Amino acid sequence: NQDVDAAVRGILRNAKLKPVYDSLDAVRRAALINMVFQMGETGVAGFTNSLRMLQQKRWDEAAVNLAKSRWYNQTPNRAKRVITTFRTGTWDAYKNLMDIFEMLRIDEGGSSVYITVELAIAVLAILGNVLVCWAVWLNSNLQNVTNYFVVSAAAADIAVGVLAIPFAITISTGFCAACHGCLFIACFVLVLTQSTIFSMLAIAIDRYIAIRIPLRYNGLVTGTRAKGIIAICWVLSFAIGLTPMLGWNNCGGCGEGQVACLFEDVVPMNYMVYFNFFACVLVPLLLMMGVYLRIFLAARERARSTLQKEVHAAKSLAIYLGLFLLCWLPLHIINCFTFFCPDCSHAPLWLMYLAIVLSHTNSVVNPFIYAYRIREFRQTFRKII
Ligand SMILES: CCNC(=O)[C@H]1O[C@@H](n2cnc3c(N)nc(NCCc4ccc(CCC(=O)O)cc4)nc32)[C@H](O)[C@@H]1O
């Protein structure tokens, strides 16, 4: 409030800023005030090229140059909102959750509907996946090797419902927390959601061998081997989700040492796109889908029944993996747009939240559906109920 007035007087004192300020529109002037307030009149005066684009009323040109700055790479979401305001002369960027004071209030630091749906998913997750584990633990006939993978996926999903989703809610509200404390929480969410994905792929591996190599399934994927695969998945989940803590983070209003706990403010975007999305979601998945497609296309009295059962299994499996991608993709596509196009306006609150909701629904119901379609599971469910 007091610093706002001082920032404007700082602009007036520097001959490199004052003429550029006068040239700006009422709204664009506030964007400059925000920028100066943040890094100082000397810092902003170092933007000789972008200042000349603003002075020449080349708005979109100024946006391009500002988005290439050290400023943008330091705090890209705040820089993006200031840049959008400089380009359009509107508060489009500040539409969710007008004057320079309110702009600074937002940057320094619907929601109820999001939290409600998120907790509804958390509850459903726990109930459904615990039921699945009870069926296998109670009913002796369900304690086979395949169900080691089913139960493993289910258990991970229970932990997602209890911990990960509540933590993900925190991560999107922006309360003031120590930067590294907020980084740890984000990593914990990344580990548990990573585990879901890997567990479903482990299930896919098990089924693939069971339908394509039925003559060696018992003699190839043992209880021991299965436990090994599951352990490996968890090792990878921790390794990946905790990677940011090893150095790949964004921090190498309310108080010193505390920051607004927001996912994108502490977790790097190149990490999420290049490493997490492409290598730990897309390639693993698409490869598995491709395998199923080839088994299906190759496939297409007792020798006949044995084949029809594998053509059906191939279609069912393809549909499951397709659904998985349809729910995980929206979120990662939004992330890609934000990362590849720094000039572009950020996705709106309702859209970002919608994508998160979708991904979390899939992250908890993958095991249950598979189990519900099995006759032995369904009847056992009723007997518990
Ligand atoms: C297996 C990998 N795990 C994941 O994908 C998990 O991470 C989380 N997540 C993956 N991207 C993201 C992501 N961009 N933002 C968030 N929250 C914060 C939402 C948010 C961001 C920016 C703004 C500013 C808007 C503006 O300037 O006008 C507002 C809200 N969580 C993610 C999900 O919970 C998923 O389950």
Q: Which of 216, 223, 204 is nearest to 321 (CA)?
A: 204
On whether 360 is known to bind a ligand per the annotation, the reply is yes
Q: Which of 220, 167, 217, 228 is nearest to 192 (CA)?
A: 167
Name the experiment that determined this structure.
Answer: X-ray
Place of tokens 């896919």: 204
Report d(CA 319, CA 119) in Å as an integer: 27
Residues with CB under 6 A from ligand 1: 77, 81, 93, 168, 171-172, 189-190, 193-194, 197, 262-264, 272, 276, 331, 335, 346, 349, 352, 356, 359-360
Which residue from 263, 328, 353, 354 has its CB within 8 A of the most atoms of ligand 1, so it is best to mutate? 263
Report d(CA 199, CA 206) in Å as an integer: 11
- Residues in CB range of 92: below 8 A, 6 or more apart: 84, 85, 345
Ligand 1: nearest atom to the Cα of 335: 14
Ligand 1: nearest atom to the Cα of 197: 1
Contact, 370 vs 135, CB < 8 A?
Answer: no
Q: How far is the CA of 201 from the centre of ligand 1 (A)?
A: 23
Domains of the chain: 2-108 (1.10.530.40), 111-384 (1.20.1070.10)
In SS3 terms, the chain reads as: CHHHHHHHHHHHHCCCCHHHHHHCCHHHHHHHHHHHHHHCHHHHHCCHHHHHHHHCCCHHHHHHHHCCCHHHHHCHHHHHHHHHHHHHCCCHHHCCCCCHHHHHHHHHCCHHHHHHHHHHHHHHHHHHHHHHHHHHHHCHHHCCCHHHHHHHHHHHHHHHHHHHHHHHHHHCCCCEEEHHHHHHHHHHHHHHHHHHHHHHHHHHHHHHHHHHCCCCCCCCCCHHHHHHHHHHHHHHHHHHHCHHHHCCCCCCCCCCCEEECCHHHHCCHHHHHHHHHHHHHHHHHHHHHHHHHHHHHHHCCHHHHHHHHHHHHHHHHHHHHHHHHHHHHHHHHHHHHHHHCCCCCCCCHHHHHHHHHHHHHHHHHHHHHHHHCCHHHHHHHHHHC
On whether 305 is known to bind a ligand per the annotation, the reply is no
Contact, 281 vs 328, CB < 8 A?
Answer: yes
Resolution (A): 3.9
Protein residue with least CA distance to atom 33, ligand 1: 356
Report d(CA 226, CA 3) in Å as an integer: 62
On whether 345 is known to bind a ligand per the annotation, the reply is no
